[PDB]
Design an enzyme around this catalytic site. Structure first.
Site, PDB file in Angstrom:
ATOM      1  N   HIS A 288       0.820   5.221  -2.150  1.00  0.00           N
ATOM      2  CA  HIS A 288       1.194   6.596  -1.781  1.00  0.00           C
ATOM      3  C   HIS A 288       2.396   7.221  -2.506  1.00  0.00           C
ATOM      4  O   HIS A 288       2.360   8.382  -2.919  1.00  0.00           O
ATOM      5  CB  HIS A 288       1.485   6.655  -0.280  1.00  0.00           C
ATOM      6  CG  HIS A 288       0.286   6.533   0.578  1.00  0.00           C
ATOM      7  ND1 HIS A 288      -0.618   7.557   0.730  1.00  0.00           N
ATOM      8  CD2 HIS A 288      -0.114   5.554   1.415  1.00  0.00           C
ATOM      9  CE1 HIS A 288      -1.586   7.177   1.548  1.00  0.00           C
ATOM     10  NE2 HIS A 288      -1.288   5.971   1.981  1.00  0.00           N
TER      11      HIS A 288
ATOM     12  N   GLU B  40      -6.304   8.942   0.806  1.00  0.00           N
ATOM     13  CA  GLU B  40      -6.519   7.498   0.785  1.00  0.00           C
ATOM     14  C   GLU B  40      -7.555   7.060  -0.251  1.00  0.00           C
ATOM     15  O   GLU B  40      -7.320   6.065  -0.906  1.00  0.00           O
ATOM     16  CB  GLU B  40      -6.837   6.914   2.192  1.00  0.00           C
ATOM     17  CG  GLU B  40      -5.778   7.127   3.270  1.00  0.00           C
ATOM     18  CD  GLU B  40      -4.485   6.343   3.205  1.00  0.00           C
ATOM     19  OE1 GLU B  40      -3.567   6.748   3.968  1.00  0.00           O
ATOM     20  OE2 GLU B  40      -4.320   5.333   2.487  1.00  0.00           O
TER      21      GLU B  40
ATOM     22  N   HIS C 186       0.809  -1.207   0.000  1.00  0.00           N
ATOM     23  CA  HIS C 186       0.000   0.000   0.000  1.00  0.00           C
ATOM     24  C   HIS C 186       0.850   1.268   0.000  1.00  0.00           C
ATOM     25  O   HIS C 186       0.564   2.200  -0.759  1.00  0.00           O
ATOM     26  CB  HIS C 186      -0.936  -0.019   1.150  1.00  0.00           C
ATOM     27  CG  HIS C 186      -1.606   1.279   1.437  1.00  0.00           C
ATOM     28  ND1 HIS C 186      -2.557   1.829   0.606  1.00  0.00           N
ATOM     29  CD2 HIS C 186      -1.475   2.138   2.485  1.00  0.00           C
ATOM     30  CE1 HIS C 186      -2.941   3.000   1.095  1.00  0.00           C
ATOM     31  NE2 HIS C 186      -2.343   3.185   2.259  1.00  0.00           N
TER      32      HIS C 186
ATOM     33  N   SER D 201      -3.710   0.616  -4.292  1.00  0.00           N
ATOM     34  CA  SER D 201      -3.017  -0.599  -3.860  1.00  0.00           C
ATOM     35  C   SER D 201      -3.931  -1.818  -3.682  1.00  0.00           C
ATOM     36  O   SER D 201      -3.406  -2.870  -3.407  1.00  0.00           O
ATOM     37  CB  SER D 201      -2.253  -0.339  -2.564  1.00  0.00           C
ATOM     38  OG  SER D 201      -3.201  -0.032  -1.498  1.00  0.00           O
TER      39      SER D 201
HETATM   40  N1  LIG Z   1      -5.392   6.329   6.733  1.00  0.00           N
HETATM   41  C1  LIG Z   1      -5.926   5.059   6.853  1.00  0.00           C
HETATM   42  N2  LIG Z   1      -6.540   4.887   8.008  1.00  0.00           N
HETATM   43  C2  LIG Z   1      -7.110   3.665   8.226  1.00  0.00           C
HETATM   44  O1  LIG Z   1      -7.878   3.483   9.397  1.00  0.00           O
HETATM   45  C3  LIG Z   1      -8.436   4.768   9.941  1.00  0.00           C
HETATM   46  C4  LIG Z   1      -7.610   5.082  11.197  1.00  0.00           C
HETATM   47  C5  LIG Z   1      -7.620   4.030  12.090  1.00  0.00           C
HETATM   48  C6  LIG Z   1      -6.935   4.011  13.254  1.00  0.00           C
HETATM   49  C7  LIG Z   1      -6.167   5.067  13.567  1.00  0.00           C
HETATM   50 CL1  LIG Z   1      -5.320   4.933  15.035  1.00  0.00          CL
HETATM   51  C8  LIG Z   1      -6.071   6.115  12.696  1.00  0.00           C
HETATM   52  C9  LIG Z   1      -6.801   6.190  11.508  1.00  0.00           C
HETATM   53  C10 LIG Z   1      -6.521   7.379  10.659  1.00  0.00           C
HETATM   54  C11 LIG Z   1      -5.166   7.664  10.345  1.00  0.00           C
HETATM   55  C12 LIG Z   1      -4.736   8.727   9.538  1.00  0.00           C
HETATM   56  C13 LIG Z   1      -5.711   9.559   9.019  1.00  0.00           C
HETATM   57  C14 LIG Z   1      -7.064   9.297   9.288  1.00  0.00           C
HETATM   58  C15 LIG Z   1      -7.472   8.222  10.093  1.00  0.00           C
HETATM   59  C16 LIG Z   1      -9.962   4.674  10.161  1.00  0.00           C
HETATM   60  F1  LIG Z   1     -10.371   3.618  10.930  1.00  0.00           F
HETATM   61  F2  LIG Z   1     -10.342   5.827  10.768  1.00  0.00           F
HETATM   62  F3  LIG Z   1     -10.700   4.555   9.024  1.00  0.00           F
HETATM   63  C17 LIG Z   1      -6.970   2.594   7.341  1.00  0.00           C
HETATM   64  C18 LIG Z   1      -6.282   2.843   6.165  1.00  0.00           C
HETATM   65  N3  LIG Z   1      -6.144   1.852   5.192  1.00  0.00           N
HETATM   66  C19 LIG Z   1      -6.473   0.480   5.416  1.00  0.00           C
HETATM   67  C20 LIG Z   1      -5.668  -0.411   4.486  1.00  0.00           C
HETATM   68  C21 LIG Z   1      -5.823  -0.080   3.023  1.00  0.00           C
HETATM   69  C22 LIG Z   1      -5.468   1.391   2.891  1.00  0.00           C
HETATM   70  C23 LIG Z   1      -6.308   2.280   3.791  1.00  0.00           C
HETATM   71  C24 LIG Z   1      -7.240  -0.399   2.511  1.00  0.00           C
HETATM   72  N4  LIG Z   1      -7.078  -1.418   1.463  1.00  0.00           N
HETATM   73  C25 LIG Z   1      -5.689  -1.194   0.978  1.00  0.00           C
HETATM   74  C26 LIG Z   1      -5.093  -2.343   0.169  1.00  0.00           C
HETATM   75  O2  LIG Z   1      -5.819  -3.395   0.155  1.00  0.00           O
HETATM   76  O3  LIG Z   1      -3.954  -2.169  -0.367  1.00  0.00           O
HETATM   77  C27 LIG Z   1      -4.878  -0.924   2.210  1.00  0.00           C
HETATM   78  N5  LIG Z   1      -5.769   4.090   5.931  1.00  0.00           N
HETATM   79 FE   LIG Z   2      -2.454   4.901   3.316  1.00  0.00          FE
END
Ligand SMILES: Nc1nc(O[C@H](c2ccc(Cl)cc2-c2ccccc2)C(F)(F)F)cc(N2CCC3(CC2)CN[C@H](C(=O)O)C3)n1
Ligand SMILES: [Fe+3]
Length: 283
Positions: free
Chosen positions: A166, A206, A161, A225
């Protein structure tokens, strides 16, 4: 009072370990491997070269699957900025089906192109801490590879990813600016403001779409990704709306499924201008 925030790039040493980690759940070999990567991230300090990792054969095979399938989709699915930078990464950072690029190489490449750099990170930072990195053009990146059973979609960020989703947009000046401005706006902000900024980030950086020469393209890294979600976002089955921060910031961020809506931006310049207007109203 303002909460602590970093004032220089080295201050990221103080938050980048404040992480929620993994805990494949029952696979002893997978767990041990995940611990190995987490420790490399925990021991990292600003100024270090990022440790280069010898990836296993299965890790490389999972990468190859992901790389191969995605590269069939990018020509028709990715925004022009993405496709402009992807060849330069092949040439300089070893993006190939049989080779996983090292975070160090990609960090050096970005530092020359946009001043972006990478820091390895052990698991999830808070939105606050993650965003604060972007303020200094630091992108926190996972270094492990997704479990081999889910090449097409994973709910957890992995190194595939980061590298395919990114990196190619961080190499683009207008995008790097956009990202850095989300970071800058977040520094020392209220919880409510961080949450709004983090949602806007989530629905652009994202999971964003953009309209280019009249057609929908993808710039969201979480789309770029995921073989399955990338197809899904441009299939005609997804609900799409104009990017508009005061609205988009209220949208719930889904974590274990495809998103229920994608926001469409006109350009990185325009999205940036929209965020500039928005941030005034939450400072
Ligand atoms: N930024 C981000 N965030 C995620 O989680 C959030 C988040 C969770 C926990 C925490 Cl501690 C922070 C954030 C949080 C952190 C930065 C800013 C805002 C939100 C939220 F839950 F809010 F949605 C999951 C994620 N992913 C998950 C994995 C994939 C990319 C996106 C999805 N499918 C891709 C692939 O298959 O290649 C990979 N990206
Ligand atoms: Fe990301």
């Amino acid at each position: 009072t303002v909460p602590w925030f970093p004032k220089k790039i080295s201050d990221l040493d103080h938050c980048a370990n404040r992480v929620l980690m993994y805990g494949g759940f029952k696979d002893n070999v997978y767990r041990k491997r995940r611990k190995y990567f987490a420790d490399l991230a925990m021991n990292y300090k600003h100024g270090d070269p990022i440790p280069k990792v010898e990836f296993t054969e299965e890790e490389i095979k999972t990468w190859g699957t992901v790389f191969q399938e995605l590269n069939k989709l990018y020509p028709t699915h990715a925004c022009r900025e993405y496709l402009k930078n992807l060849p330069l990464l092949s040439k300089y950072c070893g993006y190939r089906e049989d080779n996983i690029p090292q975070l160090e190489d990609v960090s050096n490449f970005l530092k020359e192109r946009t001043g972006f750099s990478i820091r390895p990170v052990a698991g999830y930072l808070s939105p606050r801490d993650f965003l604060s990195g972007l303020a200094f053009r630091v992108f926190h990146c996972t270094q492990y590879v997704r479990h081999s059973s889910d090449p097409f979609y994973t709910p957890e960020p992995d190194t595939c990813h980061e590298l395919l989703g990114h990196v190619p947009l961080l190499a683009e000046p207008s995008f790097a600016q956009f990202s850095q401005e989300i970071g800058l706006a977040s520094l020392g902000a209220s919880e409510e403001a961080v949450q709004k900024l983090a949602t806007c980030y989530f629905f652009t950086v994202e999971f964003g779409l953009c309209k280019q020469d009249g057609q929908l393209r993808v710039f969201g890294a979480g789309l770029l990704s995921s073989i399955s979600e990338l197809k899904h976002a441009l299939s005609g089955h997804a609900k799409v709306k104009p990017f508009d921060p005061k609205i988009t910031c209220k949208q719930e961020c889904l974590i274990t499924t495809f998103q229920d809506v994608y926001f469409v931006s006109e350009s990185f310049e325009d999205a940036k201008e929209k965020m500039r207007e928005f941030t005034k109203t939450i400072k």
